[PDB]
Curated annotation (Swiss-Prot), chain A:
Sumoylated by UBE2I in response to MEKK1-mediated stimuli. ATP binds at residues 80-87. This is 26S proteasome regulatory subunit 6A. Belongs to the AAA ATPase family. It is found in: Cytoplasm; Nucleus. Component of the 19S proteasome regulatory particle complex. The 26S proteasome consists of a 20S core particle (CP) and two 19S regulatory subunits (RP). The regulatory particle is made of a lid composed of 9 subunits, a base containing 6 ATPases including PSMC3 and few additional components. Interacts with PAAF1. Component of the 26S proteasome, a multiprotein complex involved in the ATP-dependent degradation of ubiquitinated proteins. This complex plays a key role in the maintenance of protein homeostasis by removing misfolded or damaged proteins, which could impair cellular functions, and by removing proteins whose functions are no longer required. Therefore, the proteasome participates in numerous cellular processes, including cell cycle progression, apoptosis, or DNA damage repair. The lineage of its organism: Eukaryota, Metazoa, Chordata, Craniata, Vertebrata.
From Swiss-Prot, chain C:
It is found in: Cytoplasm; Nucleus. Component of the 26S proteasome, a multiprotein complex involved in the ATP-dependent degradation of ubiquitinated proteins. This complex plays a key role in the maintenance of protein homeostasis by removing misfolded or damaged proteins, which could impair cellular functions, and by removing proteins whose functions are no longer required. Therefore, the proteasome participates in numerous cellular processes, including cell cycle progression, apoptosis, or DNA damage repair. Belongs to the AAA ATPase family. Component of the 19S proteasome regulatory particle complex. The 26S proteasome consists of a 20S core particle (CP) and two 19S regulatory subunits (RP). The regulatory particle is made of a lid composed of 9 subunits, a base containing 6 ATPases including PSMC4 and few additional components. Interacts with NR1I3. Interacts with PAAF1. Interacts with TRIM5. Interacts with ZFAND1. This is 26S proteasome regulatory subunit 6B. It comes from the Eukaryota. The chain holds residues 280 to 349 of 418 of the full protein.
UniProtKB/Swiss-Prot annotation, chain D:
Keywords: Acetylation, ATP-binding, Cytoplasm, Nucleotide-binding, Phosphoprotein, Proteasome, Ubl conjugation. GO terms for cellular component: cytoplasm; cytoplasmic ribonucleoprotein granule; cytosol; extracellular region; ficolin-1-rich granule lumen; membrane; nucleoplasm; nucleus. This is 26S proteasome regulatory subunit 7. ATP binds at residues 183-190. It is found in: Cytoplasm. Component of the 19S proteasome regulatory particle complex. The 26S proteasome consists of a 20S core particle (CP) and two 19S regulatory subunits (RP). The regulatory particle is made of a lid composed of 9 subunits, a base containing 6 ATPases including PSMC2 and few additional components. Interacts with NDC80/HEC; this interaction is detected only during M phase. Interacts and SQSTM1. Interacts with PAAF1. Directly interacts with TRIM5. Its main location: cytoplasm. It comes from Homo sapiens (Human).
From Swiss-Prot, chain F:
Belongs to the AAA ATPase family. It is found in: Cytoplasm; Nucleus. This is 26S proteasome regulatory subunit 8. It comes from Homo sapiens. It comes from the Eukaryota.
């Protein structure tokens, strides 16, 4: 399954190439690194504590979890009436963490052809795995999670 | 032929005579010059061999591609049959007024430069929708409408026939007309008559044909119906039986009601929206106008609203004569006796009466229709009433 | 386009099955759990003509199946 | 003959006929026969017979469209995907600088060594590229009568922040980026939209809600994404969603799936308007008749910050509308437009325009060339009263 | 509860009582009943809709009911509803006889029953007698 | 099938056997008829009987057959059907399963 450049006529392998990901999956990555401090979110202290302690803390202080012998939480879902500060907290987490961030949207994964959506999902997770510790944010989850 | 735009008063005037006399003088000069120069030297050989150079430039095996995008600098992206796309040069002998995305271009075999464009089929939906000359008949058959005929003419015919009247006052013609009346009064008949008597591409669509089974196809059908109505110069789009697609638009509904509402919204936008509608006239007919959408029949959308009443006393005689014209009758027919009853009879009912009378005469083998035959046919036709007697009265 | 190609396959199958001279011992057997969904062209005579049903065993068939399996 | 249209009518007709005949004679003498191969006129087989087609086929080679996928190392090494042909690892040409080529853009490549020669514009759906306005309407704010506060709010949402940006940065204000227009039919929502399109010195993209509804799953969302990417390409660009209620219906998923695809299109629109990524310099209008059916997420501030209400005009606004619509008409010197505005009870600008047109047509019917106050009164009686049931 | 109410006694947009219209359409299918008035008598002829080899013959008739010493009636529609109305007819006729000691005139008996039916179509929220 | 026989007589046989009553009444002759009912109820038999009794060719076609593979095969078949029916002066076309098309 690797990707290799070969001679046009001799068909001899000459160079091993970087993996290939869909253009959409590549666009899913964050390069501008938003700038929103936790202080810019008011009214949410328990929720911010939960999100940071579930996402950021395992990446930095993995020693605490390894010593206590407990696996870190797997996944955080944010729900509430519109305008309650969910995408804002996601942006704040992306700004404050320096690990790879993969922004994603629910409707972004629904595709015309059959199998393309699953292909996109698995490619996105593959890219996240390749690029060190990473965070995947799936906004508008209700588009596909019905 | 790309002649000067007079744009003088545009009404018969001395300034418009002078600008027009000048054009004629210049054209006379050009004609005399070309004639004399042709006599002096034919120049036919010079005109030829330029075509030979062109044919040399465009090789023998010209390939048919599909233009995808014009970079607007005599360059283009053209897709070959296999599916590949090339960035080529639009040569100077190709009529660029024909180039548009999706056109069938002729490509050079080796260099793939655009060297021509091919004509394309003429049936997006035109053959399916256009009615040609209405088979029914001309204005002669319609009897007893008169004022409605005049209103329809003032709406659709007069703007194309005498536009100076409108241009003088500066008013644009009324936008559209909606024909409403009880079932069987002549809405479709008048529409067909104007279609056959007019000089513009006439398109007919029944509202039930806009209820498609796949999401978005109703909106796409209306969009394309109005798309091939500006492509065909003056046109008249007659959406018969609008009541199927247009309705009070109650939000609390589920199923295909939402899709019908979306189709209606697209039709609304086409009738009056951000873009100018060009030169297209809309006619609509509906047995049931009270259930339509105020947004659908608001003034700016539909200006004129024509009422079609049931024939009363003499229109009935006229329809009877018209439908019995090509039918031999015995000299005992009391057509007045037939019509005298106040039976709310409709023109369609009269036509059915005549046809059934003829049919039963044929069944009995007779050579002429009789008054008793007409009476029995009328009784049979009026047998289709139903409903409850005491209820409602 | 996908459905069009599938319909092309079906039409070619029908054409081939009708293109028999009744002098070649080439027989076609076809098993389908959903015989209602089939296009009637297949059941048209000259094409598939023998419809054999394989119903759930009754008492006697159940007895015979039990005996032959045990 | 006719009743007499003008003393010069016969002369005009004769001169027009002579012009047509002379044009026919010139065409016949010069040839210019139609060609089925799409050849321009011989007078415009110009540089095409030779002298630029030759010098365009000789030096100008043929490049092939490809899409860059990856750039390897600092040293230029590009992976490209020639459509339906192959994929290569290719180098640049001496003419194109490395900064010009980025990941994901379309590049033309020569047929021999497959090296990049020219970047190309991004591929865009025809159905989304045709939404751009190109040619703007001729309407102006002066043609909208009876709406002063509404137009002021609409301007300060869509016009002033673009025209005088420093005025808001100086005071540290982030002006609203979206507005919703709602009211009874015929009040002037699309008219104000046309005025905004005309006045704006920026991209204006017109989107009709029914267009986003598509047969195949995941198509409205793709169109919305492409539209917003095209908008971001521009320095500042206005998007106008007319009849947004077509796809903005409230989320009501329950039991059997209902309008799930349209809801997904709506969700993508919401995400683009406000989401993780920062929306560009994109100001958004929306006009609708039933604001109730819109979803809370779409009607939330940050997506539709301002909600302008359009209502039937007052007596003064009706007078102004009457004047506006009678401006380009052949009318008498003194017509009491105030009297007409009073005589028409609560009614819309569409009704007033219909009244003006019907007065003109009553004149044309009576074979007059000047609409009279009596004609206007008859038009009012016909439109406002007789059609009062509609 | 408003949600489950059928609203059986309201007017339609075109001023029609749909429940009465449907009920009449129900009678349109029942067995045929025929009545002829002669100079020296009256008669009723009814299609005996029930016909089966196993049905027994009980009572003096299946659709012809005696209301008085000088009256009778036939019914077409819901059989159970007919039994309710025939009983009411017998009660009305005997109440008149008790009051006046004279048999009820036929027109008055019909009016009394029709008054009961009219009330059902106006108020009560109940279905009409089909 | 006697009722249908009488009806089809009046409908089809009259125009062909006696094409003068229609001319002298002015009522145009029917261009054809439609038959419908449950599957296998005598439609094709009745069509054959009418064709035999009016002494005309009995060209037959089916909608399923008209639904063919080659692009334009159906149009070509219809055109050939009508041209050959015209060639055979007295003719009766019996498109069988027209519902499909
Ligand atoms: N608790 C909060 N403190 C500060 N700002 C807030 C808060 N909640 C919302 N906001 C403001 O809301 C605006 C938009 O909110 P955002 O879109 O992030 O919310 P959301 O909960 O993700 O929305 P939705 O449910 O509509 O997707 C941001 O400008 C943010 O400033
Ligand atoms: N005034 C009339 N003169 C002549 N024929 C008439 C007249 N009114 C009705 N008809 C006959 O009625 C027949 C039915 O078609 P018509 O156009 O009249 O229907 P319509 O009024 O549009 O009805 P619907 O509302 O059901 O569409 C026509 O063939 C025409 O022959
Ligand atoms: N205030 C106004 N001044 C001038 N003309 C007006 C005014 N309001 C409406 N009109 C007229 O109404 C016509 C109808 O377009 P308008 O923009 O009013 O529709 P709308 O309110 O958007 O309708 P819809 O509810 O059907 O989408 C416009 O062409 C304009 O001529
Ligand atoms: Mg959010
Ligand atoms: Mg009609
Ligand atoms: Mg509008």
């Amino acid at each position: 399954g690797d990707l290799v450049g070969v001679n046009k006529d001799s068909y001899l392998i000459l160079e091993t190439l970087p993996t290939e990901y869909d253009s959409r999956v590549k666009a899913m990555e964050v390069d501008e690194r938003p700038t929103e401090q936790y202080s810019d979110i008011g009214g949410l202290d328990k929720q911010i504590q939960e999100l940071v302690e579930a996402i950021v803390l395992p990446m930095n202080h993995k020693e605490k979890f390894e010593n206590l012998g407990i696996q870190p939480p797997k996944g955080v879902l944010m729900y509430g009436p519109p305008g309650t500060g969910k995408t804002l907290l996601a942006r704040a987490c992306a700004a404050q963490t320096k690990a790879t961030f993969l922004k994603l949207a629910g409707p972004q994964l629904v595709q015309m052809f059959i199998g393309d959506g699953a292909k996109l999902v698995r490619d996105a997770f593959a890219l996240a795995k390749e690029k060190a510790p990473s965070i995947i944010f799936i906004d508008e989850l209700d588009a596909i999670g019905t | 032929a790309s002649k000067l735009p007079l744009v003088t008063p545009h009404t018969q005037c001395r300034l418009k005579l002078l600008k027009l006399e000048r054009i004629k003088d210049y054209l006379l000069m050009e004609e005399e010059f070309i004639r004399n120069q042709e006599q002096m030297k034919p120049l036919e050989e010079k005109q030829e061999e330029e075509r030979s150079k062109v044919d040399d430039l465009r090789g023998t095996p010209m390939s048919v591609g599909t233009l995808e995008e014009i970079i607007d600098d005599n360059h283009a992206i053209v897709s070959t049959s296999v599916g590949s796309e090339h960035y080529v040069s639009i040569l100077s002998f190709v009529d660029k007024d024909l180039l548009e995305p999706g056109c069938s271009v002729l490509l050079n075999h080796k260099v793939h430069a655009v060297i021509g464009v091919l004509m394309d089929d003429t049936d997006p939906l035109v053959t399916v929708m256009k009615v040609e000359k209405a088979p029914q008949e001309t204005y002669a058959d319609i009897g007893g409408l008169d004022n409605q005929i005049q209103e329809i003419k003032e709406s659709v015919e007069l703007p194309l026939t005498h536009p100076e009247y409108y241009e003088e006052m500066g008013i644009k013609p009324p936008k559209g007309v909606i024909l409403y009346g009880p079932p069987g009064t002549g809405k479709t008949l008048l529409a067909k008559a104007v279609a056959n008597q007019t000089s513009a591409t006439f398109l007919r669509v029944v509202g039930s044909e806009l209820i498609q089974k796949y999401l978005g196809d109703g909106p796409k059908l209306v969009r394309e119906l109005f798309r091939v109505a500006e492509e065909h110069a003056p046109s008249i789009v007659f959406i018969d039986e609008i009541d199927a697609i247009g309705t009070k638009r109650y939000d609390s509904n589920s199923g295909g009601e939402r899709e019908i509402q979306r189709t209606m919204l697209e039709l609304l936008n086409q009738l009056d929206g951000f873009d100018s509608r060009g030169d297209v006239k809309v006619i609509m007919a509906t047995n049931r106008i009270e259930t339509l959408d105020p947004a659908l029949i608001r003034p700016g959308r539909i200006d004129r609203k024509i009422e079609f009443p049931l024939p009363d006393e003499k229109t009935k005689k006229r329809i009877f004569q018209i439908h019995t014209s090509r039918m031999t009758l015995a000299d005992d027919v009391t057509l007045d006796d037939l019509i005298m009853a106040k039976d709310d009879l409709s023109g369609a009912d009269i036509k059915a009466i005549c046809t059934e009378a003829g049919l039963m005469a044929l069944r009995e083998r007779r050579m002429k229709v009789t008054n008793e035959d007409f009476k029995k046919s009328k009784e049979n036709v009026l047998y289709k009433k139903q409903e409850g007697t005491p209820e409602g009265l | 386009g996908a459905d069009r190609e599938v319909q092309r396959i079906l039409l070619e199958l029908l054409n081939q099955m009708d293109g028999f001279d009744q002098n070649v011992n080439v027989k076609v057997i076809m098993a389908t759990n959903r015989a209602d969904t089939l296009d009637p062209a297949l059941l048209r005579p000259g094409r598939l003509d023998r419809k054999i049903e394989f119903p759930l065993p009754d008492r006697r068939q159940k007895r015979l199946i039990f005996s032959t399996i045990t | 003959k006719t009743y007499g249209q003008s003393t010069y009518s016969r002369q005009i007709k004769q001169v027009e006929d002579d012009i047509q005949q002379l044009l026919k004679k010139i065409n016949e003498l010069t040839g210019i026969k139609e060609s089925d191969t799409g050849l321009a006129p011989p007078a415009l087989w110009d540089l095409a017979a030779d002298k630029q087609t030759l010098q365009s086929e000789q030096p100008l080679q043929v490049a092939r469209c490809t899409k860059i996928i990856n750039a390897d190392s600092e040293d230029p090494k590009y992976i490209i995907n020639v459509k339906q042909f192959a994929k290569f690892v290719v180098d640049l040409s001496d003419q194109v600088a490395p900064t010009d080529i980025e990941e994901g853009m379309r590049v033309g490549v020569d047929r021999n060594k497959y090296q990049i020669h020219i970047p190309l514009p991004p591929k865009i759906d025809p159905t989304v590229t045709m939404m751009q306005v190109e040619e703007k309407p001729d309407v102006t704010y002066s043609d909208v009568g009876g709406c002063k506060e509404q137009i002021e709010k609409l301007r300060e949402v869509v016009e002033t922040p673009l025209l005088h940006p420093e005025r808001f940065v100086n005071l540290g204000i982030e002006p609203p980026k979206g507005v919703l227009l709602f009211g009874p039919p015929g009040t002037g929502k699309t008219l104000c939209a046309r005025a905004v399109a005309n006045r704006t010195d920026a991209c204006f993209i017109r989107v009709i809600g029914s267009e986003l509804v598509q047969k195949y799953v995941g198509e409205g969302a793709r169109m919305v994404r492409e539209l917003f990417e095209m908008a971001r390409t521009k320095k500042a660009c206005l998007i106008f969603f007319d009849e947004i209620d077509a796809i903005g219906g409230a989320r009501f998923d329950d039991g059997a799936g209902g309008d799930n695809e349209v809801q997904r299109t709506m969700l993508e629109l919401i995400n683009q308007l406000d989401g993780f990524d920062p929306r560009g310099n994109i100001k958004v209008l929306m006009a609708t008749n039933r604001p109730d059916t819109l979803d809370p997420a779409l009607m939330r501030p940050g997506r539709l910050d301002r909600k302008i209400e359009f209502s039937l005009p007052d007596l003064e606004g009706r007078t102004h509308i009457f004047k506006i619509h009678a401006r380009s008409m052949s009318v008498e010197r003194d017509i009491r437009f105030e009297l007409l505005a009073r005589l028409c009870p609560n009614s819309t600008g569409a009704e007033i325009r219909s009244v003006c047109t019907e007065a003109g047509m009553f004149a044309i019917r009576a074979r007059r060339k000047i609409a009279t106050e009596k004609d206007f009164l008859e038009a009012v009686n016909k439109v406002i009263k007789s059609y009062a049931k509609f | 509860s408003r949600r489950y109410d059928s609203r059986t006694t309201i007017f339609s947009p075109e001023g029609r009582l749909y429940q009465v219209e449907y009920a009449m359409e129900a009678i349109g299918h029942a067995g045929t009943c025929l009545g002829i008035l002669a100079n020296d008598g009256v008669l009723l002829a009814a299609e005996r809709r029930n016909i089966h080899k196993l049905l027994d013959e009980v009572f003096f008739s299946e659709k012809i009911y005696k209301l008085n010493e000088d009256m009778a009636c036939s019914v077409a529609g819901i059989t159970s509803d007919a039994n309710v109305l025939t009983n009411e007819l017998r009660l009305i006729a005997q109440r008149y006889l008790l009051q006046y000691q004279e048999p009820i005139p036929c027109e008055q008996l019909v009016t009394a029953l029709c008054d009961i039916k009219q009330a059902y179509t106006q108020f009560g929220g109940k279905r009409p007698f089909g | 099938l006697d009722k249908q026989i009488k009806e089809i007589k009046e409908v089809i046989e009259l125009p062909v056997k006696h094409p003068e009553l229609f001319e002298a009444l002015g009522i145009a002759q029917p261009k054809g008829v439609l038959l419908y009912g449950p599957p296998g109820t005598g439609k094709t038999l009745l069509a054959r009987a009418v064709a035999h009794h009016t002494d005309c060719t009995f060209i037959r076609v089916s909608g399923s057959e008209l639904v063919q593979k080659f692009i334009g095969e159906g149009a070509r078949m219809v055109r050939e059907l009508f041209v050959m029916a015209r060639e055979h002066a007295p003719s009766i076309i019996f498109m069988d399963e027209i519902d499909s098309i």
